[PDB]
Amino acid sequence: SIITKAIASADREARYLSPGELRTIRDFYNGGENRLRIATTLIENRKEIVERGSLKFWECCPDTPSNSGNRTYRASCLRDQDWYIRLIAYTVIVGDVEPLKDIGIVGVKEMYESLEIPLRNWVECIRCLKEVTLDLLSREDAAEVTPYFDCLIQGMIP
Amino acid sequence: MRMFKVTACVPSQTRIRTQRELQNTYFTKLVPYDNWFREQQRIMKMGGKIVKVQLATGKPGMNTGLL
Amino acid sequence: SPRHENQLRRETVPDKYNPRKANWAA
Amino acid sequence: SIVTELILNADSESRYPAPKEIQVYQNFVKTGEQRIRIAKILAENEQRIVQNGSARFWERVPNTPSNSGNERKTASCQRDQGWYIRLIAYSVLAGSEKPLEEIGTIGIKEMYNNLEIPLRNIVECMRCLKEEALSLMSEEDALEVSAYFDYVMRSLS
Amino acid sequence: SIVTELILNADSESRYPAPKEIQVYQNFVKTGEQRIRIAKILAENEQRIVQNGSARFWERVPNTPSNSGNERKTASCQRDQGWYIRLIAYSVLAGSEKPLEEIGTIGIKEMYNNLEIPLRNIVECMRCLKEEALSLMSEEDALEVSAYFDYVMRSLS
Amino acid sequence: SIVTELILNADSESRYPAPKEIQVYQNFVKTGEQRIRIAKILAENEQRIVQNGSARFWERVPNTPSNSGNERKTASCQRDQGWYIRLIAYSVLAGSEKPLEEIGTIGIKEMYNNLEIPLRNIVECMRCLKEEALSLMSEEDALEVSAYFDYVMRSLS
Amino acid sequence: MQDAITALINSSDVQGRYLDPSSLDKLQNYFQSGDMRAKTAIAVSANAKNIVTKTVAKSLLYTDITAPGGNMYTCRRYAACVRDLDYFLRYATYAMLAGDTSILDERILNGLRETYNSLGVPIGATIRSVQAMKEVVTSLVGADAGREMGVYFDHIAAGLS
Amino acid sequence: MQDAITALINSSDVQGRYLDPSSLDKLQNYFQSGDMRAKTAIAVSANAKNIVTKTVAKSLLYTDITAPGGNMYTCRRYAACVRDLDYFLRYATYAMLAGDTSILDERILNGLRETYNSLGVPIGATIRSVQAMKEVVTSLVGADAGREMGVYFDHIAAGLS
Ligand SMILES: *[C@H](C)[C@H]1/C(=C/c2[nH]c(/C=C3N=C(/C=C4\NC(=O)C(CC)=C4C)C(C)=C\3CCC(=O)O)c(CCC(=O)O)c2C)NC(=O)[C@@H]1C
Ligand SMILES: *[C@H](C)[C@H]1/C(=C/c2[nH]c(/C=C3N=C(/C=C4\NC(=O)C(CC)=C4C)C(C)=C\3CCC(=O)O)c(CCC(=O)O)c2C)NC(=O)[C@@H]1C
Ligand SMILES: *[C@H](C)[C@H]1/C(=C/c2[nH]c(/C=C3N=C(/C=C4\NC(=O)C(CC)=C4C)C(C)=C\3CCC(=O)O)c(CCC(=O)O)c2C)NC(=O)[C@@H]1C
C-alpha cells in the first residue's frame, strides 16, 4: 500500500515520517470509506459480473481450454474469474495494487504457462470482465477500479 | 567477447550522510558487453556522467562469434 | 511414511456441444 | 381462432355472420380433423424436434447461454423450444396465429431482453426448429406450420 | 437544440417564455465554451477514436460483416462510426439529443435491418467507441457524451 | 563453433589445449564430411521441408496466425521456418549450437512476444519441421540434426 | 407533485408566513444532499435494465409465478411485470430526486391495490420484488444512497401492504 | 533528475530569493496540467507492451533493418531494440509526469549516442522508431495529451540526433 511504501521510504533514510508523507497518508485514510463502498459494490455484484464476462469471453475467445467441453476446465476458469474479481475488490479496499500484485500478478505468467493455459486468452477474459464491471460503475468509481484491471492485464501479457 | 572502453565520472550522492572515505570518481575501464547496460543504468541513476564509450573489443554488426 | 503413491491419483461426456467454435461462422 | 375472427368481424359491423363467413366457418370445421392430426404429429415428435433443432442451432451458434456448460440454462432453452412447438400446435388447432401471438409473441423481445438472451440466437434456434418440424410433415400439412414459425421469427426481429 | 425545445414549449401554451425557461436558456448559453471545446476534442480525435474502437470491437466480435474480409464493408462500418461520433458532437453542441435523434437514431433499426447488420454488434461497437471517446474527456465533460452514446445504444437495442 | 569452445576452455585456465580438448578437436574434425553432407541435404531440401512441415503444422494447429487468411503472415512464417532450417545447418557445420544461439535463440521469446506469435505454435511448427527433416537423412545424421531442433524447441519453451 | 422545497413552501404558505428557521434548515439540508441525489439518479438510470434483470432473477425467476398457470406466464404478462418493475424503479428515482414521496402517492399507489386485485396480480410477490429491487439498488449505489432510495422503495412497499 | 517544481525552486534558490510571481504562475500552470499528466501516465502504463509492439510494427518491421544484414536481424538484436524502446517509453512517461526533460538527459541520453555509434545502431532508424512511438502514443491518448507526450519524445529524438 501507499502507507507501507511511505513507511519503507522513511525507514530507508533512518528518519521519521515527513509532514508531506503524513499528509498523503491522511488523505488516503480519508478516502478509505469511499474505497470500501466501491469494493463492497464490486463484491456484491461479482456473480453477475463473472456470468456476463464469461459469456462475452467465450463468445470472443472460443478456442480456449475452458470452452472445450471439459467441465473441470470450465469450473476452474469461472473460479479464477471470481477469484480475480474478489482480488481486485480487496486491492480497491487497500487503495493500491500491492495486494493484488502480491497474490495474483507476480508469477501469474509462469503459473499459467505451467498449467498450459494461454495468457492471451486470460487477457481477453480480463478485458471482458473489465468491460462488464465498467458497465455497472460510475465514471468516478471506474477511475479507481480500472487501473487494477489494467495492471493485471499488463502483468498477464507475455 | 565484446568489450566497451568507458570513461565516466560518478560522484557520490550520500558521502556527507554516511561519512564514507573519499574515493576517486573519474575512471576509465573495460566493461563486458553483457554488463554494460546495467553499468550504464547504474551510473545514470547515481547522477554520474558517461563521458566516452568505445567498442574496445568486437566488431559492430557481428552475427556470430561473440563468445 | 516414505511412500505417497496412493495420494497421487491425479485430478467424460462433454459439457458443451461443438466446442471451440466461433458463432456465425461463414 | 378463426371462429373468433369471423365473429368479431361480424360484430364490428353489428351484423349477423354473412353467408361468406358461414362458408369459411364450415370449411374450417371440416378441416379440423386434419388440423388435429397435425397437432398430434407436433406433440408426439416434440422431443425429437427439440433435440435435432438444438443440435443444428448449436452447430451454427455454439457460444450461446444454452451451450455455456450450464445445465439449468440448457434445460430452460430446450423447454422454451418445446413451449413454442406447443404454441404452434395450438395455432394449428385454432386455425390462426392468435394463440401463439397471445401466449408467446406479445412482449417476447422484452421478456428475452430481461433474461439477457440475445434475440438473434433465438431466431436461429426457431429457424432450426422450423426445419426439423417441416421435415416431419407433407407440404400441405406444413404450410400452416411454416407460416407460424415465420410469425415467431418475425416477432423476434 | 434545447433553445428550440424551450421556444416550442412556450409556444404550445401560446405565451412568452416563463422564468424557468429563461433560466434554462441562460444556463445553457453559459456553457457554450465548454460545449465548443468538447466538440473540438471529438472532431480532432475522430479518426483515433474510430481506429481504437474498431480494434476493440473486432476483438470482441470476430464474426461481423465489418470483419469479414470485405474491404468495402470495413470502410462502411468505420464511416458509420465516424458519422455517429459526428452526430454526438452535434448533440453536445445543441445541448440535447435532438440532432443525433433526428439524423441517426429515428429509423436506425429499420436501416440496419435492411443492411443485414446485426444490431447487437452495433451496440457493442458503440460501447467500444464510447469507451475510447470518454478517455479523452475530463470528468466535467464526460456526462453529456456518455449520455448520448447511451442514447444511441438504447435506440439500437 | 566447437573449436572456439575448446580454445576458450583452454584459455580460461591460461593453458595450452589439453588432451581432452585435442581429442574433442580431432573428433570434430574427422566428421567434417558428414557435417558438410548434412548441411547440403538441409540446403537442398529446405523448400520441401518447409512445405511439408507447414502442411502438418497447419493440420495440427489450425488456429494460428500463419493460416488466418493473411498472405503476408503465411509468407513470414514460412520464411521463419526456412531461416531456422538454415540456422540448424549452420549449427551442424560448426559442431555446436553457438550460431543457433547467437542468431535465432537468444531473445527469441522477446522477439516473438513482440510479434504476438504464440510460442507453443512455434514449438509445434519446429516439431513438424524436425519430423520432416529427419525423414530425409540416415539415422546418424538424424541424431545430430534432432539435437539442434530440440535446442530450438527448448529455447522457445 | 411536491418536492422538499415545495412541501416546505406549502407548510409556510398555509400559515401565511415566510419560511421559519427550521424549514430554512431543512431546505439547506436538501440543497446539500442534492449532489448525492443527482449522482444516485445518474447511477440508477445507467443501470435500470440491469437492476430490473437482477430483481427478476433473484425474486421471480424459476418459481411457480413464471410456470404455466402463474401470473408471469406467457410473454405478455412477463413483459408487463418487467414494465411494472421499471415503473417502480423510475418513480422511486423521481421521488428520491424530489426528496418527497408525493409522486408515489399520486401516481403509483392511488388505486394500485384495486387494479392489481382486479387483474389478479400477486401483491405479496410484488412487495417481495420491490424489496429485492431495493437490495439491488443499495448494493449498486452504496449504503447511504441505498438507504435514501430505500426510503421510497419502502414507501411503495408499505402502500402495497 | 528534476521536475517542474524542483526546477523552479532551484532557479529561485540560486538567486537566494523566493519564487517570483512568474515562477508562481508557472507552478500553478503545472499544478493545473497535473490531472492530464496523471491520466496520460495511467493510459501509457496500461498499454506499454502494446505501444512497443505497434511502434516496432509500424516503424521497423518489413524494412531492410530486419532483413539479413540489418541491425535488427537475429533475435538478440531484435530483443535489444525492443528493450530500448520499452525504456524509452517508460522514461518518456516519467518526463511527462515530471513536466521536465532533465530525467531524459540524465537517464536516457547520458552516453546513449556514443554507445549506439560504437555498436553501429542506425541513428536514423532509431529516430524514426521514436517518432513512430510518439505517433502511437498520440493515437492512444489523444491529440492534446499526445502533443504533451510528444514534447518529450521529440526531446529524446533530438538528443539522439
Ligand atoms: C433457447 C432457444 C434460447 C435460450 C433460452 C433460455 N430461456 C431461459 C429462461 C426462461 N425462458 C422463459 C420463457 C418463456 N416464458 C413464457 O411465458 C414463454 C411463453 C409461453 C416463454 C418462451 C422464462 C420465463 C425463463 C425464466 C426461467 C424460468 O424458468 O422461470 C434461459 C435461462 C436464463 C437464466 O437462467 O437466467 C435460457 C438460457 N437461451 C439460448 O441461448 C437460446 C437462444
Ligand atoms: C511460423 C513458424 C510462425 C509464425 C511466424 C511469423 N513471423 C512473422 C514475422 C517476423 N518473423 C521474424 C523472424 C525473425 N527475425 C530474426 O531476426 C530471426 C532470426 C533468424 C527470426 C526467426 C521477424 C523479424 C518478423 C517481422 C517481419 C519482418 O520479417 O520484418 C509473422 C508476421 C507478423 C506480422 O504481424 O506481420 C508471422 C506470422 N506465425 C505462426 O503462427 C507460426 C507458428
Ligand atoms: C531499437 C529501437 C534500435 C536498436 C537497438 C539496439 N540496442 C542495442 C544495444 C544496446 N542498447 C543500449 C541502450 C541503452 N542503454 C541505456 O542505459 C539506455 C537508457 C535506458 C538505453 C536505451 C545498450 C547499453 C546496449 C548495449 C548493451 C546491451 O545490449 O546489453 C542493440 C544490440 C547491438 C549489438 O550489436 O548487439 C540493438 C540492436 N537497433 C536498431 O536497429 C533499432 C533502430
Coordinates of C-alpha atoms in Angstrom, one line a residue, chain F residues 38-138:
Chain F
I38 CA 24.1 -32.9 -43.7
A39 CA 24.3 -29.2 -44.5
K40 CA 24.0 -29.8 -48.2
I41 CA 20.9 -32.1 -47.5
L42 CA 19.3 -29.4 -45.4
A43 CA 20.0 -26.7 -48.0
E44 CA 18.8 -28.7 -51.0
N45 CA 15.5 -29.9 -49.3
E46 CA 14.7 -26.6 -47.5
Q47 CA 11.6 -25.8 -49.5
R48 CA 10.3 -29.4 -49.3
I49 CA 10.8 -29.5 -45.6
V50 CA 9.1 -26.1 -45.2
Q51 CA 6.1 -27.1 -47.3
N52 CA 5.6 -30.5 -45.7
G53 CA 6.1 -29.1 -42.2
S54 CA 3.7 -26.2 -42.8
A55 CA 1.1 -28.6 -44.0
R56 CA 1.4 -30.9 -41.0
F57 CA 1.6 -27.9 -38.6
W58 CA -1.5 -26.3 -40.0
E59 CA -3.3 -29.6 -39.7
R60 CA -2.2 -29.9 -36.0
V61 CA -2.7 -26.2 -35.2
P62 CA -5.4 -24.7 -37.4
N63 CA -5.8 -21.7 -35.2
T64 CA -2.5 -19.9 -35.8
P65 CA -1.5 -16.6 -37.3
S66 CA 0.0 -18.3 -40.3
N67 CA -3.2 -19.7 -41.7
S68 CA -5.5 -16.9 -40.5
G69 CA -6.1 -15.9 -44.2
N70 CA -3.2 -13.3 -44.2
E71 CA -0.8 -13.9 -47.1
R72 CA 2.0 -11.8 -45.6
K73 CA 1.7 -13.7 -42.3
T74 CA 1.9 -17.0 -44.1
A75 CA 4.9 -15.9 -46.1
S76 CA 6.6 -14.6 -42.9
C77 CA 6.0 -17.9 -41.0
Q78 CA 7.4 -19.9 -43.9
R79 CA 10.4 -17.6 -44.2
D80 CA 11.0 -18.1 -40.4
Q81 CA 10.9 -21.9 -40.9
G82 CA 13.4 -21.6 -43.7
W83 CA 15.6 -19.4 -41.6
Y84 CA 15.6 -21.9 -38.7
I85 CA 16.5 -24.7 -41.1
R86 CA 19.4 -22.6 -42.2
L87 CA 20.5 -21.9 -38.7
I88 CA 20.3 -25.6 -37.9
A89 CA 22.5 -26.2 -40.9
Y90 CA 25.0 -23.6 -39.5
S91 CA 25.0 -25.4 -36.2
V92 CA 25.6 -28.7 -37.9
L93 CA 28.5 -27.2 -39.8
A94 CA 30.0 -25.6 -36.7
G95 CA 29.6 -28.6 -34.4
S96 CA 27.9 -26.5 -31.7
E97 CA 24.7 -24.6 -31.1
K98 CA 26.5 -21.3 -30.9
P99 CA 25.3 -20.0 -34.3
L100 CA 21.8 -21.1 -33.5
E101 CA 22.1 -19.3 -30.1
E102 CA 23.5 -16.1 -31.4
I103 CA 21.2 -15.8 -34.4
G104 CA 17.9 -17.4 -33.6
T105 CA 17.7 -18.5 -29.9
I106 CA 18.9 -15.6 -27.6
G107 CA 15.9 -13.3 -27.3
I108 CA 13.6 -15.5 -29.4
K109 CA 10.9 -15.3 -26.7
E110 CA 11.1 -11.5 -26.6
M111 CA 11.0 -11.1 -30.3
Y112 CA 8.1 -13.4 -30.8
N113 CA 6.1 -12.0 -27.9
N114 CA 6.6 -8.6 -29.5
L115 CA 5.3 -10.0 -32.8
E116 CA 2.4 -11.6 -30.8
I117 CA 3.1 -15.1 -32.1
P118 CA 2.2 -17.9 -29.6
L119 CA 5.3 -19.7 -28.6
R120 CA 3.6 -23.1 -28.4
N121 CA 2.6 -22.7 -32.0
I122 CA 6.2 -22.1 -33.0
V123 CA 7.2 -25.2 -30.9
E124 CA 4.7 -27.3 -32.8
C125 CA 5.9 -25.9 -36.1
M126 CA 9.5 -26.7 -35.1
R127 CA 8.4 -30.3 -34.2
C128 CA 6.8 -30.7 -37.6
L129 CA 9.9 -29.4 -39.3
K130 CA 12.1 -31.8 -37.3
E131 CA 9.9 -34.7 -38.3
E132 CA 10.1 -33.7 -41.9
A133 CA 13.9 -33.1 -41.9
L134 CA 14.8 -36.3 -40.0
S135 CA 13.0 -38.3 -42.7
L136 CA 15.4 -37.0 -45.4
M137 CA 18.6 -38.4 -43.9
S138 CA 20.1 -41.5 -42.3

